[PDB]
Design a protein around this nucleic acid. Structure first.
Lengths: 237, 255, 122, 50
RNA sequence: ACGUUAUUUUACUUAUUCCGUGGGUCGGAAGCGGGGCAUGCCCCUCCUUUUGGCUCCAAGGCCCGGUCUUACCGGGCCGAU
RNA sequence: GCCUGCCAACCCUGGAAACGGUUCAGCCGGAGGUAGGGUCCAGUGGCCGGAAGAGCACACGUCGCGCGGUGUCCGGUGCGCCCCCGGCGGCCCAUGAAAAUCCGGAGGACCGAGUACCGUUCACGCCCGGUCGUACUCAUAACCGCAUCAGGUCUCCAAGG
RNA sequence: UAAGGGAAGGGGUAACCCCGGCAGAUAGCGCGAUCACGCGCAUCCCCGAAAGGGAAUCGGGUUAAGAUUUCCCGAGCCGG
């Protein structure tokens, strides 16, 4: 071959640096990475109270996305948008002498605001974040709604809800009113929660803690297999 | 009561400490990548270097192979019959020859070893002092346990994963033949952490030591004090099972 | 720029190692205060002693008494400014006065004797 | 004296490989070892596969 | 029945605890070798392996090559599951 | 600068029994000696350069804060003395530091040109080298003991009988 | 640089103060590099013998004095 001499060479293993390997699973972590991974796992390990683990049984992606399309109309104002609106109204009322704008319809948001709406029964549907770092805050939200018999839904992503409001954590947002046009497809959303929880209150762990552990699952398979072989062979012969 | 006694002085301080720095380096065992069917980590004995810190040698085994994260080098414990330029193999599937270190499971029953691990990676716990060796007493196909009869005579349950080195440790006979000087004794103790002369408790003052005082030479009370006794109180032959000169034996467990 | 996969892949073929990242800095715009030019005159006067006098003749060297923050570099420049001469060495002596005596070796091209006359020294 | 100085390039070295490092009869011992391992290795490899 | 409640024994991985590192090649599966078991249809329900072996050298440029966008320039993938 | 050291070590010749040389420990030679010829470490001496232009001893001069001239050389001896440096030997349950400083080799990427590009660990030439201490005693009187105290207080040089 | 001392970290101790480093380990120091970008790495980092270890000077002359050292001639040598 005029181009080159030795076409095959073995680097690899038994000489040279190996295939990279899963060092995404090994490496020395910063402290923050260590704690965050453990938290989900430990949710299973400790017995999870009746209020929780009603969570994690979340709304479907298809249902969630079409919900947001309705909310596209209702989106709350930005900092710039609100300031802009004041100038328009001020000009119109003073110079034109026109009677005030139509009543605004938007999602109402924030914990204290929305929870009050559940009590008064003003909110038709509330959309509740799965997340939120003080978990004590958000256990109350489906609990209160269920108690008063106001339909609610739990969707994943506190950030996802927050994007709509153009802020940070919304935690909850809700529709007290809806347009007549949106009303038909809004019915599907109301049905949606009672199409994953048309059930009585499942109060998860009786005493159970665990959820299955990688090492234990492998161990259990081996133990089961040995037992099964022995049992079968007594009947057979 | 009294001024504080000499044992409590260990504490910290350079005066009670030895020159640990002068000592020649780590005694560590290089932590196996995997494999090792003859020469996947190949060491070359290039020297057998005396360690002043225990007055017995560790063989200088030089592993040198590159990469970058390769970890290599330095002193595995010397065994008998080792020579310079002989290759040393460290790991799971290593050949059965003297001076090689491998898991105890793959070593057959009835086989003399030096060093054992009292849980994997602690590098050498059982038999390290000269002319001593453990002999691996039992195994069977036991996944859980390798049983080793120690030089203390104790039969110990230890994991089958734990590494041991074939052979007995070198420099044997060291302690057996007598010093025949006070001055020879001084030099050994100087290099290690010990203060050399032993003043007797009788020879000390009553303030310094419980056994001190009295016009004539004598220990005033019973030497044997309780194990449960607190620090300061606890002197003499602590919790002696018997005394006076006859018919004991080595540590003798039964199973 | 950085598409996150790239950082992950670099760590993937490594057994840990160290770190590496960089980030910028900025100086203010408000003008930190105090504008000054508090400055001492390193050369104060040619020092005059019997032992100074002989050296001018002998070895082409004026002898000055100078500041206590003297060196060799600044004083050589100062001598050049104020008396128009090249200085070949500067030599430093602590005195019991608490100031620094300087022996400053001068050029043979313009003699220390005829430098001396206009800043007279005995 | 032995670093970047009045001395010329030659004085730090001997021309042969491992000039300052190994003695010369020591150098040939490792050339012999290099020779033996390569020739033996092919013989070992073909034997094992068969 | 729902478990409730109380003694002790015993076991798992997450608290805690010990130790190992310039966290390395871990675990599980399958590639590829091949053996033993009844070796029967491979033989799973298993055991060895899985690039390095005498032979004071040496194993570093994630490699030459293969392959694809890509005229060369230059970038991937694979070689090394 | 030129030349030069034996022990240690190494190269080549050669093929040893009537085996040799040889250490304070048996070590050279049987993985090649004794012996012959080389090579290396360059402590050191030599002669030359330095460098007499210096210095030393003389004569003469006041010609003085200094004038003119010479001569200053060649051997020998060792259980001497001191120190160094070399390579050995005794010692040990004692086996007797580390770093700045730092070159080498292996490594071969990358860059190599001709009327120029590459070496630039070479020679020669050009400039520069900052900061601080330097007096002097160092003791029967400059230190410490109230103190010009017979005391004490670390080290180097070490004539002749 | 040593024996050793001591900031930095975590943690006790109100606190003084003491061990002494840590998530400088996918927190940045170091080298190409001028071009903005890439590559590489820890047990750090300073003090610690005016005795250890060590970049590099000799001669003559001189004053009240040590002079390789002050001065000066002549000759170097080291680093940039």
């Amino acid at each position: 071959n005029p181009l080159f001499e030795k076409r095959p060479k073995q680097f690899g293993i038994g000489g040279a640096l190996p295939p990279k390997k899963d060092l995404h699973r090994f490496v020395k972590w910063p402290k923050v990475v260590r704690i965050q991974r453990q938290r989900r796992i430990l949710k299973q390990r400790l017995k999870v109270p009746p209020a929780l683990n009603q969570f994690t049984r979340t709304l479907d992606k298809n249902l969630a996305t079409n919900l947001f399309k309705m909310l596209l109309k209702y989106r709350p104002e930005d900092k710039a948008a609100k300031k802009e609106r004041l100038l328009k109204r001020a000009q119109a009322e003073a110079e034109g002498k026109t009677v005030e704008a139509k009543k605004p319809i938007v999602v109402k948001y924030g914990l204290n605001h929305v929870t009050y709406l559940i009590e008064q029964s003003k909110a038709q549907l509330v959309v509740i974040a799965h997340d939120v770092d003080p978990i004590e805050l958000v256990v109350w939200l489906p609990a209160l709604c269920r108690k008063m018999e106001v339909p609610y839904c739990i969707v994943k992503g506190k950030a996802r809800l927050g994007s709509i409001v153009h802020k940070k954590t919304a935690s909850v947002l809700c529709l007290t009113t809806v347009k007549n046009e949106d009303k038909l497809e809004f019915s599907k959303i109301l049905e949606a929660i009672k199409a994953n929880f048309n059930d009585k209150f499942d109060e998860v762990r009786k005493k159970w803690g665990g959820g299955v552990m990688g090492s234990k699952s492998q161990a259990k398979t081996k133990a089961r297999e040995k037992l099964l072989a022995k049992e079968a062979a007594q009947r057979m012969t | 009561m009294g001024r504080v006694i000499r044992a409590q002085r260990k504490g910290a301080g350079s005066v009670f400490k030895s020159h640990t720095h002068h000592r020649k380096g780590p005694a560590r065992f290089r932590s196996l990548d995997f494999g090792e069917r003859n020469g996947y980590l190949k060491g070359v004995v290039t020297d057998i270097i005396h360690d002043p810190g225990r007055g017995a040698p560790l063989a200088k085994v030089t592993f040198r192979h590159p990469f970058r994260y390769k970890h290599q080098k330095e002193l595995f414990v010397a065994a008998e019959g080792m020579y310079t330029g002989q290759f040393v193999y460290c790991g799971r599937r290593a050949t059965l020859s003297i001076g090689n270190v491998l898991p105890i499971r793959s070593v057959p029953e009835g086989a003399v070893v030096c060093n054992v691990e009292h849980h994997v990676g602690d590098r050498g716990v059982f038999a390290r002092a000269s002319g001593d060796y453990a002999i691996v007493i039992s195994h069977n196909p036991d996944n859980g346990t390798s049983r080793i009869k120690l030089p203390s005579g104790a039969k110990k349950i230890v994991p089958s994963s734990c590494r041991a080195m074939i052979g007995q440790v070198a420099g044997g006979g060291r302690t057996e033949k007598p010093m025949l000087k006070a001055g020879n004794a001084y030099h050994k103790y100087r290099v290690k952490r010990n203060c050399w002369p032993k003043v007797r408790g009788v020879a000390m003052n009553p303030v310094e030591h419980p056994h001190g005082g009295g016009n004539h030479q004598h220990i005033g009370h019973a030497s044997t004090v309780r194990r449960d006794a607190p620090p300061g109180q606890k002197v003499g032959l602590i919790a002696a099972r018997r005394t006076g000169r006859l018919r004991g034996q080595a540590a003798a467990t039964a199973a | 720029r950085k598409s996150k996969k790239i950082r992950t892949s670099v760590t993937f073929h490594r057994p840990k190692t160290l770190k590496k990242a960089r980030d910028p800095k900025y100086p203010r715009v408000s003008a930190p205060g105090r504008n000054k030019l508090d400055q001492y005159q390193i050369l104060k006067y040619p020092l005059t002693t019997e032992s100074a006098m002989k050296k001018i003749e002998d070895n082409n060297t004026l002898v000055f008494i100078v500041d206590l923050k003297a060196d060799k570099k600044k004083i050589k420049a100062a001598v050049k400014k104020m008396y128009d001469i090249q200085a070949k060495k500067v030599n430093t002596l602590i005195r019991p006065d608490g100031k620094k005596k300087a022996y400053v070796k001068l050029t043979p091209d313009y003699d220390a004797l005829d430098v001396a006359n206009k800043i007279g020294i005995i | 004296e032995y670093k970047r100085p009045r001395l010329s390039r030659n004085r730090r070295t001997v021309n042969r490989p491992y000039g300052g490092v190994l003695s010369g009869p020591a150098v040939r011992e490792r050339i012999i070892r290099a020779f033996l391992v390569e020739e033996q290795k092919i013989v070992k490899k073909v034997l094992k596969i068969q």
